[PDB]
Design an enzyme around this catalytic site. Structure first.
Site, PDB file in Angstrom:
ATOM      1  N   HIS A  36     -13.710 -27.366  45.106  1.00 20.29           N
ATOM      2  CA  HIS A  36     -13.316 -28.600  44.830  1.00 20.29           C
ATOM      3  C   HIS A  36     -11.688 -28.485  44.827  1.00 20.29           C
ATOM      4  O   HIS A  36     -10.960 -28.604  45.990  1.00 20.29           O
ATOM      5  CB  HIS A  36     -13.671 -29.388  43.755  1.00 20.29           C
ATOM      6  CG  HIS A  36     -13.281 -30.890  43.796  1.00 20.29           C
ATOM      7  ND1 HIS A  36     -12.781 -31.372  42.672  1.00 20.29           N
ATOM      8  CD2 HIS A  36     -13.181 -31.713  44.841  1.00 20.29           C
ATOM      9  CE1 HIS A  36     -12.615 -32.734  42.783  1.00 20.29           C
ATOM     10  NE2 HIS A  36     -12.592 -32.548  44.187  1.00 20.29           N
ATOM     11  N   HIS A  61     -13.522 -31.068  37.165  1.00 14.77           N
ATOM     12  CA  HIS A  61     -13.965 -32.422  37.417  1.00 14.77           C
ATOM     13  C   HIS A  61     -15.610 -32.225  37.538  1.00 14.77           C
ATOM     14  O   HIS A  61     -16.298 -33.021  37.829  1.00 14.77           O
ATOM     15  CB  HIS A  61     -13.575 -33.053  38.610  1.00 14.77           C
ATOM     16  CG  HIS A  61     -11.914 -32.930  39.022  1.00 14.77           C
ATOM     17  ND1 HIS A  61     -11.465 -32.025  39.873  1.00 14.77           N
ATOM     18  CD2 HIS A  61     -11.120 -33.847  38.644  1.00 14.77           C
ATOM     19  CE1 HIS A  61     -10.200 -32.133  39.572  1.00 14.77           C
ATOM     20  NE2 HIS A  61      -9.851 -33.144  38.786  1.00 14.77           N
TER      21      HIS A  61
HETATM   22  S1  FES Z   1     -11.675 -28.383  40.329  1.00  8.71           S
HETATM   23 FE1  FES Z   1     -13.653 -27.972  40.232  1.00  8.71          FE
HETATM   24  S2  FES Z   1     -14.637 -29.924  40.178  1.00  8.71           S
HETATM   25 FE2  FES Z   1     -12.462 -30.289  40.635  1.00  8.71          FE
END
Ligand code: FES
Ligand code: MGD
Ligand code: MGD
Ligand code: F3S
Ligand code: FES
Ligand code: 4MO
Ligand code: NA
Lengths: 824, 135, 135
Positions: free
Chosen positions: C64, C83
């Site tokens: 992510h 997140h």
């Molecule tokens: S940085 Fe890993 S869920 Fe967004």
């Protein structure tokens, strides 16, 4: 992704053998497989191809494009480059690849490629929606219905349309598995074949006359003085046989070899004769290569083949251009055939439309003795223009008469042969019924409880296809509506619900396939199958050359080899009968204890004619046991021409080049038998269409498109070039209808209605057309009739219709070439 | 490293206004072993360049097995003498009929209105007989 | 210049038999700014390596927005604190729930039966925050 480079195979990449998936010729290929993050070097000894990519390659050095590459993701999740390229040392193709075989890598299954929508698991239409289901549930439902039908109606309630062919979606393992299941276990006679609506042969007459249809070698096309191509467009339909064997002859490159084999025989420049109503790409290319003076196009009136061969036969007999010693020693019925088949050249010309001078010239080239005294070596090749022609049985009678009288079987550089369609790979029990049954008519008439399409799609490829689809969709709907009432039913209750709907006009429809296809519009159950490379598979080509295609990757999901689907079904049915205490019925389902496809090879091909074996009809004959996987591997892509004559570890498999070279035919008395061939015009059903409507609706193959386009429909290049089935039309006819290239037309008659995009073609005769068969967008078969010959062989090439402008598809005009496909 | 694209050279072909309708020009790109043709077709086609958006250019090596194709002015196609493939110069090298599994590669031309120059700057498709367009 | 593959190093991690069931080892691959874990899962999984076909390895950077994920022994997953994306160590980094559009990248291990050695030889998937796995 990137269009401007490819990853070379490393020097040590794994290499396996693969026969082309597709057409009869069975070109040999190698599959290179290696981990995704390795690659070869450009230096020739640092890549598996042994080619020097440090500077431009010359012409003919390679066939390699991005379409010949892929990246597969196996069941272990690891990613592997593949490259599928033609084998330069294979005798069949000598490193040639057709545009169809060339795409094999692209049509291997990958999660994101052209194979993305491969069937990966059982699919069930649960009354009002497609869902996944388990294999156990699928077998409970499918075997449960078969069992219920067997128990209450007997075998006559269980219907199949099944491949009988070789290559992908066929072959010796697969034809045995399915045949054993249908014929020895279930014992149903309600079976048709992928391309014809009964359990019959394309070649009843030639076989009954004692001449099996694959009687020569590809080398014979190199030794011929004259090649006939009858009802056949080989550049497009048997590409690499034509390119690698026929053309070298026309070009003079085989003259040495003829003269070496036959020291005291004249060999003129080779010539080629085409019997085809239509001027095809093959005619054009033959003229470009050999010149106009060495090509004869007998552009006969549709369906007049019998009259042509009777006129030719009559003439060679009157001229004495026949082999009287041969006829006297090795044939029966000649004197009778001379009388029954008598037809003057003038009458021949009037029926066929071919001028007398051209009929005489064809005979002169083909049958008049050479200066050195021997008859020309004339190889007579034929395919679907006469197999699906005006009375299959009679045309072959007429042609084989001419061939036998002129001794054009059993001599090198001759043969009266099928060019073939798919590859061949037949090993089956005998058909269990005593009559021919028109399966499609029976389904249309409301018979049968369960119908399985297995490795075919008659929605696109039946004759009278619109009647078939109408009926099947309706019958399917009755079952869907019945299922709809159920809630919370056990599998056994569902079987009962569906069975009852079939007493009320319903039909349960299963498809065993690579893809959903148009069958998904009516199917209730779809089972995922595996193709060559995801399985081992054996097959032979048009000269009987058997090869092993080696497994090199996993199938998508829980896709399985068709022979193992058949074993799975059999074992389900057995378990059910054992559990129901029916030992005798259980025993009918023995002999499917198979763990791999090789088991099916051992049980079928390799048992044929053996002691203790049941009755088995096999293209391998009774020496089939001499072939093993291992032995085929050692043979390579050259394989062995069947039948095998011997084997030992030092000399390998040794096989048979040409049939009938000693004058012993496959009849009771060992002679070839002549047959009467009456000329009765067109069938009434067809003549009625011709009387009512304007255009002859000829149909068949396009070079680029394979069959029902099951792969090609997912290929963006294919879809850009042929977004819709096209119809070749005469330009003058086009102007009269105010259509041009990229317009859409309706084509219709009493049998049905379909659509095509207009492809003006100068070489098309006025009042004649040619539409692509079998396609995913505009099914041609809607306008074919129900008429069949005495053996239920359809006249697929025999239909007439009218044409009506729908409108102008501007997008097709912007994207599709309507330029000429006849090279000059 | 870091680089995902090939390092294509920029080669001047000619000035657009020198080209006559349907009279092909020969040049090499991206090296002297890669023969190419540019042609002014006479009517606009998609992606055509120059003042009348009708100039197109191709690698002439057949993508089947690499023979040099010939441009046919009557049909605006490239014909291969090897196994009879034919490519449509007006449909971005769409194969009309033949044994190739790739369209005839397009040579990407920049057209500079300022100078009237046509410059070959890249290739769309893979030229026959090469591991990469740029050796 | 012919080359389509990245130049991955061959980095020894450990010997297989040193690894205990469900006790992750930390290492860097393909450079010291790329943190990874190898773990013996205890039961075979597809593409697992070692004697019991149960050893797997991953980049731990969330795909992510690149926080280092932590291995949870109770669930055999990698959890992102950023997140809340969670990746399945038993399903080749399949995202169980979360905001990534790419599975956790697998470090490809060679296991040599002769030496019992585990060597990192490549990466399947693209590590967070990089134009290419090999900088
Ligand atoms: S940085 Fe890993 S869920 Fe967004
Ligand atoms: N009008 C008209 N109609 C014709 C003809 C014609 O000339 N004119 N020609 C006739 C002839 S010669 C033929 S051969 C037929 C063809 O009619 P079909 O046999 O109906 O058509 P194919 O496209 O060969 O069908 C093969 C099907 O099997 C699937 N398949 C491929 N590989 C496998 C495999 O490994 N396993 C399984 N289970 N399925 C597989 C494909 O996805 C596809 O649905 O059409 C006939 N119909
Ligand atoms: N490119 C390609 N090749 C294939 C296939 C494919 O789908 N694509 N399918 C394969 C299969 S399964 C088969 S069966 C073969 C078929 O190969 P062919 O039979 O060679 O092909 P068709 O195009 O069906 O028909 C051959 C010719 O019959 C002619 N014809 C029509 N009516 C008559 C008539 O009354 N008499 C005579 N003498 N000729 C007539 C047509 O004009 C046509 O040119 O091709 C195989 N090869
Ligand atoms: S490549 Fe395949 S399609 Fe026929 S001509 Fe050769 S077997
Ligand atoms: S090399 Fe051009 S068609 Fe084969
Ligand atoms: Mo066929
Ligand atoms: Na219709």
């Amino acid at each position: 992704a990137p269009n401007d480079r490819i990853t070379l195979p490393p020097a040590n990449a794994q290499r396996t053998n693969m026969t082309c998936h597709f057409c009869i010729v069975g070109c040999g290929y190698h599959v290179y497989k290696w981990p995704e993050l390795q690659e070869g070097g450009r230096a020739p000894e640092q890549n598996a191809l042994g080619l020097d990519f440090r500077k431009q390659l010359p012409p003919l050095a390679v066939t390699l494009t991005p379409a010949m590459t892929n990246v597969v993701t196996e069941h272990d999740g690891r990613r592997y480059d593949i490259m599928v390229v033609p084998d330069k040392a294979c005798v069949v193709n000598s490193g040639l690849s057709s545009t169809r075989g060339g795409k094999m890598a692209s049509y291997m299954y990958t999660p994101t490629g052209d194979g993305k929508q491969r069937l990966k698991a059982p699919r069930l239409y649960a009354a009002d929606q497609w869902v996944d289901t388990t294999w156990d549930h699928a077998m409970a439902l499918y075997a449960g219905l078969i069992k219920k039908t067997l128990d209450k109606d007997g075998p006559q309630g269980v219907f199949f349309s099944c491949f009988d062919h070789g290559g992908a979606g066929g072959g010796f393992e697969n034809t045995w598995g399915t045949g054993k299941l249908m014929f020895s276990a279930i014992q149903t006679p309600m079976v048709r074949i992928h391309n014809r609506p009964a359990y019959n042969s394309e070649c009843h007459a030639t076989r009954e006359m004692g001449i099996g249809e694959l009687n020569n070698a590809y080398e014979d096309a190199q030794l011929a003085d004259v090649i006939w191509s009858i009802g056949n467009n080989p550049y497009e339909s048997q590409t690499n046989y034509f390119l690698n064997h026929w053309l070298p002859n026309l070009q003079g490159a085989t003259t040495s070899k003829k003269k070496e084999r036959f020291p005291n025989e004249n060999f003129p420049q080779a010539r080629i004769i085409f019997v085809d109503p239509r001027e095809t790409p093959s005619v054009a290319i033959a003229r470009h290569v050999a010149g106009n003076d060495r090509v004869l196009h007998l552009a006969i009136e549709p369906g007049t083949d019998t009259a042509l061969f009777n006129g030719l036969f009559t003439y060679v007999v009157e001229q004495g251009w026949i082999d009287k010693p041969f006829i006297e020693a090795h044939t029966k019925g000649f004197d009778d055939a001379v009388k029954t088949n008598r037809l003057s050249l003038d009458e021949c010309s009037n029926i066929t439309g071919v001028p007398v001078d051209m009929l005489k010239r064809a005979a002169e080239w083909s049958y008049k003795p050479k200066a050195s005294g021997q008859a020309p070596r004339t190889m007579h090749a034929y395919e679907k223009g006469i197999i699906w022609g005006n009375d299959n049985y009679v045309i072959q009678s007429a042609l084989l008469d001419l061939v036998i009288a002129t001794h054009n079987v059993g001599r090198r550089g001759t043969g009266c042969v099928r060019m073939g369609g798919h590859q061949e790979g037949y090993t089956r029990p005998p058909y269990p019924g005593d009559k021919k049954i028109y399966i499609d008519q029976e389904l249309i008439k409301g018979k049968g409880r369960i119908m399985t399409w297995w490795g075919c799609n008659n929605f696109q490829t039946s004759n009278n296809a619109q009647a078939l689809r109408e009926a099947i969709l309706q019958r399917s709907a009755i079952v869907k509506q019945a299922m709809q009432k159920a809630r919370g039913a056990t599998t056994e209750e569902m079987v009962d619900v569906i069975y009852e709907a079939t007493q009320n006009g319903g039909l349960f429809v299963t498809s065993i396939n690579l893809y959903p296809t148009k069958l998904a519009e009516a199917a209730h159950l779809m089972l995922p199958a595996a193709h060559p490379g995801e399985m081992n598979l054996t097959s032979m080509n048009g000269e009987r050359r058997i090869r092993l295609s080696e497994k090199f990757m996993d199938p998508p999901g829980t896709a399985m080899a068709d022979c193992l689907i058949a074993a799975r079904i059999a074992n389900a049915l057995r378990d059910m009968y054992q559990k129901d205490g029916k030992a005798e019925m259980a025993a009918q389902f023995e002999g499917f204890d198979w763990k791999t496809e090789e088991d099916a090879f051992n049980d079928g091909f390799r048992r044929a004619g053996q002691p203790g074996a049941p009755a088995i009809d096999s293209q391998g004959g009774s020496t089939g046991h001499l072939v093993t996987y291992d032995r085929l591997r050692k043979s390579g892509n050259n394989g062995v021409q069947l039948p095998v004559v011997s084997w030992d570890e030092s000399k390998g498999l040794v096989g048979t080049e040409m049939l009938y070279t000693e004058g012993k035919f496959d009849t009771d008395d060992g002679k070839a038998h002549f047959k009467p061939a009456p000329w009765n015009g067109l069938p009434a059903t067809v003549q009625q269409q011709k009387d009512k409507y304007r255009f002859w609706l000829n149909n068949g193959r396009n070079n680029e498109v394979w069959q029902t386009a099951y792969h090609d429909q997912y290929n963006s290049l294919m879809q850009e070039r042929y977004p819709m089935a096209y119809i070749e039309m005469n330009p003058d006819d086009c102007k009269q209808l105010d259509v041009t290239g990229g317009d859409i037309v309706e084509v219709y008659n009493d049998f049905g209605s379909t659509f095509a995009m207009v492809y003006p073609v100068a070489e098309i005769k006025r009042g004649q057309t040619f539409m692509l068969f079998g396609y995913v967008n505009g099914i041609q078969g809607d306008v074919t009739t129900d008429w069949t010959d005495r053996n239920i062989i359809p006249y697929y090439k025999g239909t007439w219709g009218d044409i009506r402008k729908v409108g102008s598809m501007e997008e097709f005009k912007r994207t599709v070439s309507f330029k000429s496909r006849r090279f000059a | 490293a870091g680089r995902t694209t090939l390092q294509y050279p920029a080669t001047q072909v000619s000035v657009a206004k020198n080209l006559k309708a349907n009279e092909p020009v020969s040049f090499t790109y991206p090296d002297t072993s890669s023969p190419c043709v540019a042609v002014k077709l006479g009517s606009p086609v998609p992606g055509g360049v120059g003042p009348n958006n009708d100039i197109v250019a191709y690698s002439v090596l057949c993508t089947h097995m690499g023979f040099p194709t010939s441009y046919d002015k009557s049909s605006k196609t490239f014909k291969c003498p090897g196994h009879f493939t034919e490519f449509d110069a007006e449909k971005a090298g769409q194969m009309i009929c033949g044994q190739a599994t790739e369209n005839l590669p397009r040579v990407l031309l920049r057209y500079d209105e300022a100078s009237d120059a046509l410059t070959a700057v890249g290739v769309d498709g893979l030229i026959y007989g090469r591991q990469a367009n740029v050796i």
